[PDB]
Design a protein around this ligand. Structure first.
Ligand SMILES: CN1C(=O)[C@@](c2ccc(OC(F)(F)F)cc2)(c2ccc(F)c(-c3cncnc3)c2)N=C1N
Length: 366
């Protein structure tokens, strides 16, 4: 039942959401980052200054060595193998999954994040060292009767700050959202790639060729904190946001996501910052639906501007997902969005999912 899966995610603001998992026999308990932006099950497997726990292969009676190393600059190095894996507050099953045992790394783990590994939930095409290394979720579906679908409700903090959420594996929990679920097609099965057809700041269209929004791609990534936008789109966005909040301005170190901005105890002028609407391509070619996010989402806790520039396409990260219940419907190659039961909002504005909006070529081919 999904009830036992509710609130199975925890984390620190800006450091990602993790789920408890066990690996090996007897079960070794570890906290694992839920990451829709990668496809490896990679776990710390050797002492590290930021790790308080790590996977000890020699303690597992069920560990099997694949006699194959892996080098991943992007960095971390490790040895490939397989072992039994379970999610205590997920489905009641045990699967034999590939595991990359990380023996050395640089700038990979985060101090105080309280996770020791990453659960890459994306597709095999982007798995390291290649696509023959079956990702965890693929193993899970193939080995069990679990439906090929999972959903994420990231809730952030609300009033480093602690965050919480739910990962529901194998179905949709209706208690986690209100209103309608709107679906955007998964363009290609590598990252969770989608297509943005329009974006507006306070109802004002940025008026860009929609290819700009997906240059060179747009992905949904729980493993990225910020909403990351292509250079040209980012500049247009900041300008519009700056203008809307012109009433008393801020340092540019803030707009660059460097410096923080501070008011005190519920004096934050949310109403000065505009809402941002991302229109996603619908299941019907000429249709779209918009997800609308509040300053409560893109200003993350004093606050930091959680929108930043990208040279690798648009990334709809945690701060975007935190407004919504997000359904990764792998079985039907689509991603669903609905207003989250947990999202933060004031008494004048709320996050929204609304459609359809019809138009009269937005993908950046590959
Ligand atoms: C964008 N991104 C990362 O850089 C990564 C990552 C990079 C390379 C990987 O190994 C490969 F390449 F083999 F897949 C696997 C995953 C990542 C790595 C470490 C992190 F602390 C975070 C992170 C940091 N703060 C908040 N939340 C997540 C993200 N996860 C995502 N989505």
């Amino acid at each position: 039942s999904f009830v036992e899966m509710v609130d199975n995610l925890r984390g620190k603001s800006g450091q990602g959401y993790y789920v408890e998992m066990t690996v090996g026999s007897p079960p070794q308990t570890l906290n694992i980052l839920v990451d829709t932006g990668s496809s490896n099950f990679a776990v710390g497997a050797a002492p590290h200054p930021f790790l308080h726990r790590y996977y000890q292969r020699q303690l597992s009676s069920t560990y099997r060595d694949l006699r194959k190393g892996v080098y991943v600059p992007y960095k971390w190095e490790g040895e490939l193998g397989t072992d039994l894996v379970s999610i205590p507050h997920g489905p009641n099953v045990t699967v034999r999954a590939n595991i990359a045992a990380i023996t050395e790394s640089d700038k990979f783990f985060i101090n105080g994040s309280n996770w020791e590994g990453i659960l890459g939930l994306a597709y095999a095409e982007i798995a390291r060292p290649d696509d023959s290394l079956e990702p965890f979720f693929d193993s899970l579906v193939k080995q069990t009767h679990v439906p090929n679908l999972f959903s994420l409700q990231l809730c952030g903090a609300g009033f480093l700050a602690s965050v919480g959420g739910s990962m529901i594996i194998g179905g949709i929990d209706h208690s986690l959202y209100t209103g309608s679920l709107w679906y955007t097609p998964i363009r290609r099965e590598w990252y969770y790639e989608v297509i943005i057809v329009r974006v507006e700041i306070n109802g004002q269209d940025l008026k860009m060729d929609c290819k700009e929004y997906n240059y060179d791609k747009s992905i949904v990534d729980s493993g990225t904190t910020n909403l990351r936008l292509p250079k040209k789109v980012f500049e247009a966005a900041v300008k519009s946001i700056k203008a809307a909040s012109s009433t008393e301005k801020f340092p540019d170190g803030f707009w660059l996501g460097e410096q923080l901005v501070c008011w005190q105890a519920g004096t934050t002028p949310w109403n000065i910052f505009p809402v941002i609407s991302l229109y996603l391509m619908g299941e019907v070619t000429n249709q779209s639906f918009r997800i609308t996010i509040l300053p409560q989402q893109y200003l993350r806790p004093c606050y930091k501007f959680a929108i930043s520039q990208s040279s690798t396409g648009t990334v709809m990260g945690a701060v975007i997902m935190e407004g919504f219940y997000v359904v990764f419907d792998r079985a039907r190659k689509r991603i669903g969005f609905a207003v989250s039961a947990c999202h933060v909002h004031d008494e004048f504005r709320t996050a929204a999912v609304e459609g359809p909006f019809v138009t009269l070529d937005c993908g950046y081919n590959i």
